[PDB]
Design a protein around this ligand. Structure first.
Ligand code: CLA
Ligand code: CLA
Ligand code: CLA
Ligand code: CLA
Ligand code: CLA
Ligand code: CLA
Ligand code: CLA
Ligand SMILES: CCCCCCCCCCCCCCCC(=O)OC[C@H](COP(=O)(O)OC[C@@H](O)CO)OC(=O)CCCCCCCCCCCCCCC
Ligand SMILES: CC1=C(/C=C/C(C)=C/C=C/C(C)=C/C=C/C=C(C)/C=C/C=C(C)/C=C/C2=C(C)CCCC2(C)C)C(C)(C)CCC1
Ligand SMILES: CC1=C(/C=C/C(C)=C/C=C/C(C)=C/C=C/C=C(C)/C=C/C=C(C)/C=C/C2=C(C)CCCC2(C)C)C(C)(C)CCC1
Ligand SMILES: CC1=C(C/C=C(\C)CCC[C@H](C)CCC[C@H](C)CCCC(C)C)C(=O)c2ccccc2C1=O
Ligand code: SF4
Ligand code: SF4
Lengths: 220, 80, 143, 70, 154, 741
C-alpha cells in the first residue's frame, strides 16, 4: 500500500510540476501565440480564431495546477491520516490489507470514519461535533458552488443580467432606486478566480472537519 | 478602449474590414503591398474586442492585432 | 383587436403598452401611491411609506421569532422591527450620500435635501407604525 | 339488432345525424338541397353520416340500457 | 351608442330612461349595471362553491348563505368591507378621470378595438344580467327554505 | 388529392462512398488536414439539413434512417426474448415467482468473473435482471420457452425486413416531398391505423390468450397442464367454462347487450390480491376502449374525400386580441421544418416517459412486479432519465429551428413573433420565480440543519415544530380514496392504493401501500418545482435568445453551435443556444437525480417492506424519511451513507460487478471535470510540445494533431459527467435494492 500510494504521490507531484513548468516556460509565447508577452500574465484569451484560445495566458496554468495541488495534498493527507489512525487503533493489518485497492480506500477510511462526523447532530439530538458536521456540509456546499463558476461561463450570465436590468428599469416604484455602476457579469479571469477560490475553500473546510471530528470521536 | 494595430505583413485582403461589426477598420492606400492598400483603425474607440478581424486574417500570424485595455460603455457593448 | 401596442407610440423603446402596464387601474393605483402622488412633499412621501412598512414589519418577528413562545414575544418583535428599521434608514442615508453627491435644488426626491427629508419621514413613520402595531397587538382583545 | 325500441332509436339517431350534419358548410339543416348534397359529396355523405349515427346510437342505447329506460 | 343590445330582446328600454337623460346619467346607469352584474356573478359563484366546498373556518360555517355571513367573525367582515371600499375609491377616481368609459378599468379606448371587443363586452353584460336574477333568487330561496342552492337542488 | 408518388432508383448501391468517408459534407469531402476533421465527420454525420438543401432528400434520408432505427429496436426485442428463451430461469420463476430471482444473463468463466453467476434459485446461476421482462411475458401468457424462441426468430425476421425496407425506400423507390407533407393522412393513419388497431389487436390477444392462462395460473394450474393458446383461441367450450359470457358469442356485441361481457370486461380497479398487480380483465377493457377512442379520433382530418378537418384552417381560426394573428403560419412552419416537429415530439415523448414512470410504480400492471422491488425502482428511474433527456432534446431542436428554419416573412406578428418580442419579460419573470422558489425551498432545509446543529428542534420546519402540510395533496388523495363510491360508482376499488385504502401484500412483501404526505414531502416537492423551473429557465432562454440578444445582435449569423464571439463586451462565452442546452443538461441531471432519490427513500421507508400475519408492518429503512428527510445532513447520513453499505461491501459476491461499476462511474465523473474546467489553449500548447517530441524522432503524423474544439470539449465533459453520474446511481440503486429486497 505504501508503494502504490507513494507512486500516486509521485504522479501527482510530476503532473503539478508539468502544468506549472509549462505555464512558466510558455508564458512568454507559444506556437499558437508567439506574442503572449505583449498581452501579459493574466488575460482572458485570444478569441475563437485559430481553433480557440481558452486558458492560454499562463495565469490559467496556475488555475489549473491549483486543482492538482489540492489533489496531491489531499492524497498525501489521506495516506497520513489513515496509516496513523490504524496504528493508533492497533489495527495496522487493516491498512496493510485494504490500502492496496481503491474500494478499500473508499470503504475503510472515508465511509468507516465518517460516522462520528455525520452523527454530530441527528434527529435524536446533538453532540459537541455538531459544529464539525455543519462545517462538513458547508464545505461541501462551497465546493459544489465553485463548480458553477468553473463550468458556466460569462455570456449566459451577461444575457441574464441584461434581462434583470430590463426588469428593474421597467418595474414601477423600484425603478426610482437606480444603480450607479452598470451591473455586468463577472469577467472571465474574475470568475475563474472566484470558482477556484470556492473549490479550494470548500476543499479545506470539508476536509478539516473530517480529519478533526473523526480523530476526536475515535480517539485513535 | 482597446488598441487596434496593423503591421506591414498585410496583404490587402480587406477581409478584416468585412469581419468588422463596428466599422473600426478601413482600407487606406499603401506602397508595400501589391494590392496597394493596407488596413487601418481610425475608430479604435468603437472597438469591442471580439477579434473577428483576427479570426478572418489569413496571414501566418495576424497582421491586424487587437490588445484589450481600458473598458468603456462602448467597449463593453452595454445597451444600458 | 390589438391590446398590446408600442409604449407611448414608440416601437423602438424597450417596453410594451400591455393592460398590466398601462391600464387605468394600474395608472390610478401607481399615481396615487405616496411615492408618485401629486403635491406630496418628500417628507410626506417618506412618512406614509414609513408607517406603512413599520406597521407590518413587526408581525414576522412577533409570530415566527425565536421567542414567539415566550411572554416577551411582542416586545422582542418590536425590538427586531426597530433594528431592521435602523438598518433600512442607514441604507437610505448611504444611498442618498452615494447617489445625490452634488445637489442644491431640494424639494425633489432626486436631490440631496429631498432624499434626506424622505429618509427622515421614513424613519419617524416606521418607528411610529411599529409602535402602533405593538399597541394594537397588545390590545388585540378589542377586535 | 334484436329489439324494436333499439331499431327505432338507431334509425332516429341516424336520420337526425344525417339531417343536422354539415360538411364544408353544406347540410340539410343549413338549407342545402338533397340533390346538391348528393352531387357534391356522393356516398361519403351517407357513410360518415351513418357511422356517426351508429356511434351516437350506441351511446344513447347503452345509456338507456344502463338507466333502465329501454 | 353602447353594447347592451342583444338578440332576444333587442334594445330593451320600455320606460324611456335612455332618452331625456344626460350622458353622465347614461354613464352612471351603465357603471351601475356592470357593477351589479359583476357583484352578482361573484355572489352566485360564491354560493355555488360554498354550498358543497367550504374548507375555511375549519369547515364549521353553515352552507346557508344568509347564516354563514352571520357566523363569519367581525374582523373578516371589516377586511372585506375595507377591500371593497378600496376598489370603490378606485372606481370613484376612474369616474373623475376625463376619459372615463363606464366600467372600464382596463382603459380600452387606447387600443385598436374591433367588433369582437363589443361582442365580448356583451357576453359580460348578459352573464351579469343572468347572475343578477340568479343571485337574488338564491338569496330568496335561502331565506325561504333555509337551504343553499345546491342543497335545495338535492 | 392524397396519393402515392415516388422516384424510381434515386440512388445507386455502391461502396465508393463507403470508401470516401466525408462524402456527405462539402468541406470534409476534400480530405483531412487535422484531427478536427475526424471529429467534424461524426458531428455532421446526421445533419442532413446542413449536408443538403432539398427538403425532399432530407425527408427521404430521415425515412430510411427511421427504418434502420426500427431494425435495431427489433434486434433489441429479439435479444430480450431469445435470452429469456435460452439463458434464463423463466420456467423456474414461472413455477415459483416469489422465491425465484429473475435472471436471463450468464457470464463465461474466463478471469474469475464466474462469481457474477450468483445463486438466483431454481438450480440456475446467472446475473439477476431488473427489466421486468419476466413479469411482462407472464402477463402476455408465455408459459414455455419454445414461444420465446419463436418470437425471437420472428423479431429477427422483422429486423431483416426493416433493413430491407430502409434500403428499398432510399435506393429503389423513394417518396416525394408531396408524399411526405400529407400530415392529415399521416395523422389519420397513426391514430386509427397504428394506435387504434394496435390497441384493438392487443385487446383481442388479451381477451383470448392472456385472461385464460393468467386465471389458470392464479388458480394454481402449473404451466405444463395449461391449455395451449392455439387450443384456447378456438375452443369456445373451454373459454365458456372459464368465463361464462363467452358461450353467448358475438351476438351480445353486435346487438348492444355489451353488459353480457361483464365477467371478462370489468371495471374492478385496484390490484389483484393474488399477483398484486392490475386486473388483466381491466387491462383488456382499457385497451378496447382506447382502440375505440383512437379509431374515432383518426377520422378527423381531411383526405381524398370531402369530409374532414384541415389543420391549417383550425390553426388560422384561433386568434385573440392579445395575440394578433394567432396561430397563422404554424402549419407552414411544421410542414416545412423537421426540427420543429422533432422538438414537439421529443417534448411529448419525454413527458410521456415521466408519466409512465409515475404510473407504473403506483399501479403495478404486470403480475408479481410489485413485490419485485428491483424491477420497480429500475423501471421508474430509467424512464425518468429517458424523459429528462428527451425534454432537453426538445429544447435543443427548438433552438435549432429558431436558428435555421425561422423566418419573419412567414411569422409576422404570429405567436412566435409575439413571444420573441417579449422574451425579456418572460425570462426575467421566470428568473424571479426560480430565485424565490429555490431560496424558500432550500432555505427550509438549511434552516432545519442550522436549528438541529444549534440544538433547537422546536424551531424546525418539521412535522411537530413548524408544520408545512400539503393540504391540497391530502385533499386530492381523500377525493381519490372516496371516488369509487361517489364519483366513480361502477368502479369497485381505487385507481391506486397510494392514495389510500388497504395494504396490498403478496406473501410477506408489500406490493402497494398508501403513501402519506407531510412536511418532508412538501419540502421535496417544492425542491422538484425549483429544479424544473431552473431547467426551463436555461432551456427557454437558449431557445428565445437563439436568434440574437442585447449582447450579440447577430447571433443567428454565427450559427447554432459556435464557441463564442471573442473576449469583447467583457466576454461572450457560451452565448450559443447549444451552450444553453449544455448547461441545461446539468440541471435536468440534478432534477432527475433528486427525483429518483426522493422516490427511492420514500418507497423504502414508507411502502416497501414486509407485513406479518398479525398485521405488523416493517419497512426496509423503518420509516425514517418523515423525520430524517428534513435536513441535508439527514439526506447525507440516512440515505447516502446508510444505503452505500450494500454497494461498498459487495466485493467477493455477485454484486462485486456493481461495486466495480460504482468505482468506475465515480472515476468517469471525476474525469469529466478535466474537460469541463480546462480550456483548449493549454492543451494545444501541450500538444505542440508533444508534437516536437515526435518530430524529433521523425514520426509526427501527416494529419496534424489538434486539441479538441471548444464545443467538443464541452460536449465531452458533459457526456462523461452524465455517464459517471448515471452509472454511479445505477450501480448504487441496483446493489442496494438487490441486496435488501
Ligand atoms: C428562505 C427560507 C427560510 C425561511 C422560510 C425561514 C424562516 C424562519 N427563520 Mg430562518 N433561516 C434560513 C432560511 C429561512 N428561514 C437560513 C438559510 C438560515 C441559515 C442562516 C436561517 C437561520 C435562522 C435562524 C438562526 C433563525 C431563523 C428563524 C426563522 C424564523 C423567523 C425569521 C424572521 O424573523 O424573519 C423575519 C422576516 C421578515 C421580517 C420578512 C419576511 C418576508 C415577507 C413576509 C415577504 C412578504 C412578501 C409580499 C407577499 C410581497 C408582495 C406584497 C404586495 C402584494 C403588497 C422563520 C420561521 C428564527 C426562529 O426562531 O426560527 C423558528 C431563528 O432564530 N432562521
Ligand atoms: C340521451 C342519451 C344518453 C344517456 C341517457 C346517457 C347516459 C350515460 N352516459 Mg352517455 N352518451 C350519449 C348519450 C346518452 N348517455 C351519447 C349520444 C354519447 C356519444 C356517443 C355518449 C357517450 C358516452 C360515453 C363515452 C360515456 C357515457 C356515459 C354515460 C353514463 C354516465 C354519464 C355521466 O354522468 O358521466 C359522468 C360525469 C362526469 C362529469 C365525468 C367526467 C369525466 C372526465 C374525463 C373528467 C350515463 C349512463 C359514461 C359511462 O360510464 O357510461 C356507463 C361514459 O363513459 N356516455
Ligand atoms: C339594476 C340593474 C340594471 C341597470 C342599472 C341597467 C341599466 C341599463 N340597461 Mg338593463 N338590464 C338589467 C339590469 C339593469 N340594467 C337586467 C337584469 C336585465 C335582464 C332582463 C337587463 C336587460 C337589458 C337589456 C336587454 C338592455 C338593457 C339596457 C340597459 C340600459 C338602458 C335602460 C335603462 O336606462 O335602464 C335603467 C334601469 C334602472 C334605473 C334600474 C331600476 C329599474 C326599476 C325602477 C326597478 C327594477 C325593475 C323591476 C322591479 C325588477 C326587480 C323585480 C324582481 C325581478 C326582483 C342601461 C345601461 C339596454 C342597453 O344597454 O342598450 C344600449 C339594453 O339593450 N338592459
Ligand atoms: C395504418 C397505416 C400505417 C401504419 C401501421 C404505420 C406505422 C408506422 N409509421 Mg406511418 N405512415 C402511414 C401509415 C401508417 N404508418 C402513411 C399513410 C404515411 C404517409 C402519409 C406514413 C408516413 C410515415 C412516415 C414518414 C414515418 C412513418 C413511421 C411509422 C412508424 C412509427 C413508429 C412506431 O410507432 O413504430 C411502431 C412499429 C411497429 C408497430 C412494428 C411494425 C412495423 C411495420 C408496420 C411492419 C410506424 C411503423 C416512421 C418510421 O418508422 O419510418 C420508417 C416514419 O418516419 N409513417
Ligand atoms: C383483432 C382482435 C380480435 C380477433 C383477431 C378476434 C378473434 C376471434 N374472436 Mg374476438 N373479440 C375481440 C377481438 C378480437 N377477436 C374483442 C375486442 C372482444 C371483446 C368484445 C372479443 C370478444 C369475443 C368473443 C366473446 C368471442 C370472440 C370470438 C372470436 C373468434 C371469431 C369468430 C368469427 O369470426 O365468427 C376469433 C377467435 C369467439 C370465439 O371463438 O371465442 C372462443 C367468441 O365467442 N371474440
Ligand atoms: C429523436 C431523437 C433525435 C434526433 C433524430 C436527433 C437528431 C439530431 N441531433 Mg440530437 N438530440 C436528441 C435527440 C435527437 N437528436 C436529444 C435527446 C438531445 C438532448 C441530449 C439532443 C441534443 C442535440 C444537440 C445539442 C445537437 C443535436 C444535433 C443533432 C443533429 C446531428 C446529430 C449527429 O449527427 O449525431 C451523430 C452521433 C454522434 C455524434 C454520437 C453521439 C454520442 C453520444 C454523445 C454519447 C453516447 C453514449 C452511449 C449511449 C453510452 C456510452 C457508454 C460507455 C460505457 C462506453 C441531428 C439533426 C446537433 C445539431 O447540430 O443539430 C442540428 C446538435 O448540436 N442533438
Ligand atoms: C451548490 C451549488 C450551486 C448553487 C448554490 C447554485 C446556485 C444557483 N444556481 Mg446553479 N449551478 C451549479 C451549482 C450551484 N448553483 C452548477 C454546478 C452549475 C453548472 C452546471 C450551475 C449552473 C447554473 C446556471 C446555468 C444557472 C444556475 C442558477 C442558479 C441560481 C438559481 C436560483 C436560486 O434558487 O437562487 C437562490 C439561491 C440559492 C438556491 C442558493 C442557496 C440559498 C440559501 C437558502 C440562502 C438564501 C437566503 C439569503 C439571501 C442568503 C443567506 C444569508 C447570507 C447573507 C449569509 C442560484 C444562484 C440559475 C439562475 O441564475 O437563475 C436565476 C441559472 O441560470 N446555476
Ligand atoms: C404565469 C404567467 C401568466 C402571465 C402571462 C400570460 C399572458 C398570455 O400569455 O397572453 C394572454 C393570452 C390570451 O389569449 P388570447 O385569447 O389572446 O389567445 C387566443 C389564443 O387562441 C392564442 O392565440 O393567454 C392567456 O389568457 C394566458 C393566461 C395564463 C394565465
Ligand atoms: C392593494 C391590494 C392588496 C395589498 C394590500 C396591502 C399592501 C396592504 C397593506 C396594509 C398596511 C401595511 C397598512 C398599514 C397601516 C399603518 C398604520 C395605520 C400606521 C399608523 C401609524 C401611526 C398612527 C403613527 C404614529 C406616530 C408617528 C407618525 C411618529 C411618532 C410616533 C407616533 C406613534 C405618534 C392586496 C394584496 C390585498 C390585493 C388587493 C389590492
Ligand atoms: C376556461 C377554464 C379555465 C381556464 C383555463 C385556462 C386559463 C387555460 C389556459 C390555457 C393555456 C394558456 C394554454 C396554452 C397552450 C399552449 C400550447 C399548446 C403551446 C404549444 C407550443 C408549441 C407547439 C411550440 C412549438 C415550438 C417549439 C417547441 C420550439 C420551436 C418553435 C415551435 C413553435 C415550433 C378554468 C381553469 C377556470 C377551469 C374551467 C375552464
Ligand atoms: C484533456 C483535454 C484535452 C486533451 C485531449 C485531446 C487532445 C484529444 C484526445 C482524444 C483521444 C486521442 C481519443 C482516443 C483515446 C485513446 C485512448 C487513444 C488510443 C487510440 C489511438 C489509436 C488514437 C483537450 O484537448 C481539451 C480541449 C478543450 C477542452 C478541454 C480539453 C481537455 O480537457
Ligand atoms: S492580413 Fe489582415 S489586415 Fe491585412 S489585408 Fe488581410 S485581413 Fe486585412
Ligand atoms: S468562450 Fe471564454 S475561453 Fe473560449 S474563446 Fe471565448 S472568452 Fe476565451
Amino acid at each position: 500500500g505504501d508503494f502504490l500510494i507513494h507512486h500516486a504521490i509521485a504522479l501527482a507531484l510530476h503532473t503539478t510540476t508539468l502544468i506549472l513548468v509549462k505555464g512558466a516556460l510558455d508564458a512568454r509565447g507559444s506556437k499558437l501565440m508567439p506574442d503572449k508577452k505583449d498581452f501579459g500574465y493574466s488575460f482572458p484569451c485570444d478569441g475563437p480564431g485559430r481553433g480557440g484560445t481558452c486558458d492560454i495566458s499562463a495565469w490559467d496554468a496556475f488555475y489549473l495546477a491549483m486543482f492538482w495541488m489540492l489533489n496531491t495534498i489531499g492524497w498525501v493527507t489521506f495516506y497520513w491520516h489513515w496509516k496513523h489512525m490504524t496504528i493508533w487503533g492497533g489495527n495496522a493489518a487493516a491498512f496493510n490489507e485494504s490500502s492496496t485497492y481503491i474500494m478499500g480506500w473508499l470503504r475503510d477510511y472515508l465511509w468507516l470514519n465518517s460516522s462520528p462526523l455525520i452523527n454530530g447532530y441527528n434527529a435524536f439530538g446533538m453532540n459537541a461535533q455538531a459544529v464539525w458536521a455543519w462545517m462538513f456540509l458547508f464545505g461541501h456546499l462551497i465546493w459544489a458552488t465553485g463548480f458553477m463558476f468553473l463550468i458556466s461561463w460569462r455570456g449566459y450570465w451577461q444575457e441574464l443580467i441584461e434581462t434583470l436590468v430590463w426588469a428593474h428599469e421597467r418595474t414601477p416604484i423600484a425603478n426610482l432606486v437606480k444603480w450607479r455602476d452598470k451591473p455586468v457579469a463577472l469577467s472571465i479571469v474574475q470568475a475563474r478566480l472566484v470558482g477556484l477560490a470556492h473549490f479550494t475553500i470548500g476543499y479545506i473546510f470539508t476536509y478539516a472537519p473530517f480529519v478533526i471530528a473523526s480523530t476526536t470521536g475515535k480517539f485513535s | 478602449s482597446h488598441s487596434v494595430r496593423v503591421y506591414d505583413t498585410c496583404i490587402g485582403c480587406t477581409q478584416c474590414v468585412r469581419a468588422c461589426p463596428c466599422d473600426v477598420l478601413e482600407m487606406v492606400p499603401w506602397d508595400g503591398c501589391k494590392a496597394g492598400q493596407i488596413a487601418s483603425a481610425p475608430r479604435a474607440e468603437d472597438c469591442i474586442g471580439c477579434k473577428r478581424c483576427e479570426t478572418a486574417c489569413p496571414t501566418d500570424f495576424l497582421s491586424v492585432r487587437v490588445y484589450l485595455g481600458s473598458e468603456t460603455t462602448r467597449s463593453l457593448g452595454l445597451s444600458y | 383587436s390589438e391590446f398590446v401596442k408600442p409604449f407611448n407610440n414608440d416601437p423602438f423603446v424597450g417596453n410594451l403598452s400591455t393592460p398590466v402596464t398601462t391600464s387605468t387601474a394600474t395608472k390610478l393605483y401607481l399615481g396615487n401611491l405616496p411615492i408618485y402622488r401629486k403635491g406630496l412633499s418628500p417628507l410626506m412621501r417618506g412618512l406614509e411609506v414609513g408607517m406603512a412598512h413599520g406597521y407590518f414589519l413587526i408581525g414576522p418577528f412577533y409570530i415566527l421569532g425565536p421567542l414567539r413562545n415566550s411572554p416577551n414575544a411582542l416586545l422582542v418583535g418590536l425590538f427586531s422591527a426597530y433594528g431592521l428599521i435602523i438598518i433600512l434608514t442607514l441604507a437610505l442615508t448611504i444611498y442618498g450620500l452615494a447617489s445625490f453627491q452634488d445637489n442644491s435644488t431640494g424639494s425633489n426626491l432626486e436631490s440631496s435635501k429631498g432624499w434626506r427629508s424622505f429618509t427622515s419621514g421614513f424613519t419617524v413613520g416606521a418607528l411610529g407604525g411599529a409602535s402602533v402595531a405593538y399597541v394594537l397587538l397588545n390590545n388585540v382583545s378589542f377586535f | 339488432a334484436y329489439s324494436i325500441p333499439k331499431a327505432f332509436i338507431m334509425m332516429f339517431c341516424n336520420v337526425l345525424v344525417i339531417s343536422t350534419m354539415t360538411i364544408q358548410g353544406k347540410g340539410l339543416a343549413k338549407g342545402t338541397p338533397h340533390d346538391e348534397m348528393v352531387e357534391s359529396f356522393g356516398i361519403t355523405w351517407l357513410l360518415a353520416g351513418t357511422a356517426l349515427g351508429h356511434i351516437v346510437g350506441a351511446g344513447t342505447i347503452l345509456g338507456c340500457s344502463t338507466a333502465g329506460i329501454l | 351608442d353602447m353594447v347592451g343590445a342583444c338578440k332576444p330582446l333587442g334594445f330593451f328600454d320600455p320606460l324611456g330612461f335612455s332618452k331625456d337623460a344626460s350622458p353622465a346619467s347614461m354613464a352612471k346607469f351603465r357603471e351601475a349595471e356592470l357593477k351589479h352584474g359583476r357583484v352578482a356573478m361573484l355572489a352566485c359563484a360564491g354560493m355555488i362553491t360554498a354550498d358543497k366546498f367550504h374548507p375555511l373556518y375549519d369547515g364549521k360555517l353553515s352552507s346557508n348563505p344568509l347564516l354563514a355571513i352571520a357566523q363569519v367573525p367581525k374582523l373578516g367582515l371589516l377586511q372585506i368591507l375595507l377591500f371593497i371600499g378600496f376598489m370603490e375609491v378606485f372606481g370613484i377616481l376612474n369616474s373623475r378621470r376625463p376619459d372615463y368609459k363606464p366600467g372600464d378599468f382596463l382603459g380600452s379606448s387606447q387600443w385598436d378595438t374591433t367588433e369582437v371587443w363589443d361582442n365580448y363586452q356583451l357576453r359580460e353584460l348578459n352573464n351579469g344580467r343572468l347572475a343578477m336574477f340568479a343571485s337574488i333568487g338564491m338569496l330568496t330561496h335561502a331565506y325561504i327554505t333555509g337551504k343553499g342552492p345546491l342543497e335545495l337542488l338535492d | 388529392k392524397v396519393r402515392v408518388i415516388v422516384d424510381k432508383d434515386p440512388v445507386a448501391t455502391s461502396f465508393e462512398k463507403w470508401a470516401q468517408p466525408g462524402h456527405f459534407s462539402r468541406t470534409l469531402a476534400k480530405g483531412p488536414k487535422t484531427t478536427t476533421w475526424i471529429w467534424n465527420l461524426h458531428a455532421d454525420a446526421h445533419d442532413f439539413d446542413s449536408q443538403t438543401s432539398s427538403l425532399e432528400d432530407i425527408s427521404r434520408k430521415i425515412f430510411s434512417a427511421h427504418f434502420g432505427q426500427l431494425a435495431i429496436i427489433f434486434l433489441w426485442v429479439s435479444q430480450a426474448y431469445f435470452h429469456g428463451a435460452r439463458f434464463s430461469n423463466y420456467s423456474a420463476w414461472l413455477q415459483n415467482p416469489t422465491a425465484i430471482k429473475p435472471s436471463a444473463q450468464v457470464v463465461w468463466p474466463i478471469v474469475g468473473q464466474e462469481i457474477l453467476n450468483g445463486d438466483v434459485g431454481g438450480g440456475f446461476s446467472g446475473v439477476q435482471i431488473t427489466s421486468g421482462v419476466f413479469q411482462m411475458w407472464r402477463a402476455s401468457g408465455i408459459t414455455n420457452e419454445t414461444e420465446l424462441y419463436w418470437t425471437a426468430m420472428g423479431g429477427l425476421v422483422m429486423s431483416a425486413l426493416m433493413v430491407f425496407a430502409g434500403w428499398f425506400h432510399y435506393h429503389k423507390a423513394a417518396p416525394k416531398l408531396e408524399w411526405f407533407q400529407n400530415v392529415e393522412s399521416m395523422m389519420n393513419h397513426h391514430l386509427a391505423g397504428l394506435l387504434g388497431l394496435g390497441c384493438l389487436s392487443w385487446s383481442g390477444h388479451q381477451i383470448h390468450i392472456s385472461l385464460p392462462i393468467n386465471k389458470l395460473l392464479d388458480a394454481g394450474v402449473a404451466p405444463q397442464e395449461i391449455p395451449l393458446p392455439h387450443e384456447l383461441l378456438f375452443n369456445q367450450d373451454l373459454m365458456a367454462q372459464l368465463y361464462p359470457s363467452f358461450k353467448k358469442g358475438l351476438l351480445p356485441f353486435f346487438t348492444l347487450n355489451w353488459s353480457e361481457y361483464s365477467d371478462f370486461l370489468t371495471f374492478k380497479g385496484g390490484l389483484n390480491p393474488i399477483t398484486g398487480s392490475l386486473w388483466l380483465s381491466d387491462t383488456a377493457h382499457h385497451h378496447l376502449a382506447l382502440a375505440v377512442l383512437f379509431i374515432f379520433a383518426g377520422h378527423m382530418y381531411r383526405t381524398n374525400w370531402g369530409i374532414g378537418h384541415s389543420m391549417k384552417e383550425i390553426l388560422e381560426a384561433h386568434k385573440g386580441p392579445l395575440t394578433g394573428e394567432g396561430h397563422k403560419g404554424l402549419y407552414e412552419i411544421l410542414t416545412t421544418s423537421w426540427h420543429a416537429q422533432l422538438a414537439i415530439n421529443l417534448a411529448m415523448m419525454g413527458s410521456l416517459s415521466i408519466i409512465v414512470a409515475h404510473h407504473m410504480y403506483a399501479m403495478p400492471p404486470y403480475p408479481y412486479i410489485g413485490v419485485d422491488y428491483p424491477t420497480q425502482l429500475s423501471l421508474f428511474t430509467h424512464h425518468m432519465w429517458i424523459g429528462g433527456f428527451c425534454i432537453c432534446g426538445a429544447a435543443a431542436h427548438g433552438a435549432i429551428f429558431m436558428v435555421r428554419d425561422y423566418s419573419p416573412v412567414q411569422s409576422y406578428n404570429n405567436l412566435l413573433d409575439r413571444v420573441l418580442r417579449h422574451r425579456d419579460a418572460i425570462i426575467s419573470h421566470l428568473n424571479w420565480v426560480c430565485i424565490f422558489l429555490g431560496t424558500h425551498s432550500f432555505g427550509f432545509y438549511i434552516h432545519n440543519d442550522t436549528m438541529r446543529a444549534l440544538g433547537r428542534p422546536q424551531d424546525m420546519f418539521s412535522d411537530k415544530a413548524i408544520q408545512l402540510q400539503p393540504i391540497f395533496a391530502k385533499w386530492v388523495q381523500s377525493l381519490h380514496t372516496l371516488a369509487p363510491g361517489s364519483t366513480a360508482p361502477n368502479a369497485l376499488a381505487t385507481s391506486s392504493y397510494a392514495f389510500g385504502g388497504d395494504v396490498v401484500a403478496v406473501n410477506g412483501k408489500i406490493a402497494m401501500m398508501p403513501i402519506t404526505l407531510g412536511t418532508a414531502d412538501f419540502m421535496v416537492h417544492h425542491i422538484h418545482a425549483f429544479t424544473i423551473h431552473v431547467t426551463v429557465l436555461i432551456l427557454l432562454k437558449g431557445v428565445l435568445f437563439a436568434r440574437s440578444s442585447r449582447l450579440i445582435p447577430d447571433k443567428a449569423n454565427l450559427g447554432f453551435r459556435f464557441p463564442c464571439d471573442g473576449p469583447g463586451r467583457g466576454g461572450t462565452c457560451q452565448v450559443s443556444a447549444w451552450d444553453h442546452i449544455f448547461l441545461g443538461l446539468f440541471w435536468m441531471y440534478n432534477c432527475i437525480s433528486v427525483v429518483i432519490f426522493h422516490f427511492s427513500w420514500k418507497m423504502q421507508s414508507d411502502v416497501w417492506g414486509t407485513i406479518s400475519s398479525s398485521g405488523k408492518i416493517s419497512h426496509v429503512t423503518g420509516g425514517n424519511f418523515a423525520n430524517s428527510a428534513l435536513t441535508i445532513n439527514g439526506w447525507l447520513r440516512d440515505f447516502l451513507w446508510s444505503q452505500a453499505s450494500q454497494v461498498i461491501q459487495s466485493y467477493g459476491s455477485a454484486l462485486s460487478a456493481y461495486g466495480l461499476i460504482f468505482l468506475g462511474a465515480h472515476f468517469i465523473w471525476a474525469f469529466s471535470l478535466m474537460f469541463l474546467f480546462s480550456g483548449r489553449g493549454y492543451w494545444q500548447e501541450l500538444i505542440e510540445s508533444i508534437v516536437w517530441a515526435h518530430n524529433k524522432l521523425k514520426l509526427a503524423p501527416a494529419i496534424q494533431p489538434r486539441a479538441l474544439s471548444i464545443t467538443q470539449g464541452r460536449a465531452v465533459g458533459l457526456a462523461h459527467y452524465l455517464l459517471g453520474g448515471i452509472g454511479t446511481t445505477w450501480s448504487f440503486f441496483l446493489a442496494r435494492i438487490i441486496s435488501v429486497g
